[PDB]
Amino acid sequence: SSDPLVVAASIIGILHLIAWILDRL
Amino acid sequence: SSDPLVVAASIIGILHLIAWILDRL
Amino acid sequence: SSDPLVVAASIIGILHLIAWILDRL
Amino acid sequence: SSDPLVVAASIIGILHLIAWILDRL
Ligand SMILES: N[C@]12C[C@H]3C[C@H](C[C@H](C3)C1)C2
């Protein structure tokens, strides 16, 4: 729904940032 | 308004992350 | 405060994504 | 919990964006 989709997009952003931080380390 | 603009900025962040994930794949 | 700081960090994320989208265009 | 984890992922996204902005400057 319109509420769960916004949370799903936020989870993807966190996973992408985690990968980048791991590459910089 | 001040509430819809914050959601609009969040949607843009998710679209940008999706493109990056597609490039890495 | 603990509520305004979370919004301030979100605004920075949107500005960073906007710059990236402008570079890709 | 399910509420604190979502905030923790958001904090990581802000730190990653701050580093990028510092590199561009
Ligand atoms: N709420 C957030 C949406 C998007 C991804 C992540 C970091 C920024 C940009 C704020 C959580």
Overview of the molecule:
The structure is a homotetramer of 25-residue chains. With 25 residues, chain A is mainly alpha-helical. Chain A has one helix and no strands. The first copy, chain A, has one helix at 2-24. The first copy, chain A, is rod-shaped, with a radius of gyration of 11 Å. The N and C termini of chain A lie far apart (37 Å). Chains in contact: A-B, A-D, B-C, C-D. Chains A and B meet through helix 1 of A and helix 1 of B. The complex binds (3S,5S,7S)-tricyclo[3.3.1.1~3,7~]decan-1-amine. (3S,5S,7S)-tricyclo[3.3.1.1~3,7~]decan-1-amine binds next to helix 1 of chain A. The site of (3S,5S,7S)-tricyclo[3.3.1.1~3,7~]decan-1-amine (308) has 2 residues of chain A, from helix 1.
Structural key phrases:
rod-shaped, 1 helix, binds (3S,5S,7S)-tricyclo[3.3.1.1~3,7~]decan-1-amine, homotetramer, 25 residues, 0% strand, Matrix protein 2 (chains A, B, C, D), mainly alpha, 92% helix
Outline the fold blueprint.
4 copies of one chain form a homotetramer.
Chain A: H1 2-24
Main location (chains A, B, C, D): virion
Site (Seems to be involved in pH gating) (chains A, B, C, D): 20
GO molecular function (chains A, B, C, D): identical protein binding; monoatomic ion channel activity; proton transmembrane transporter activity
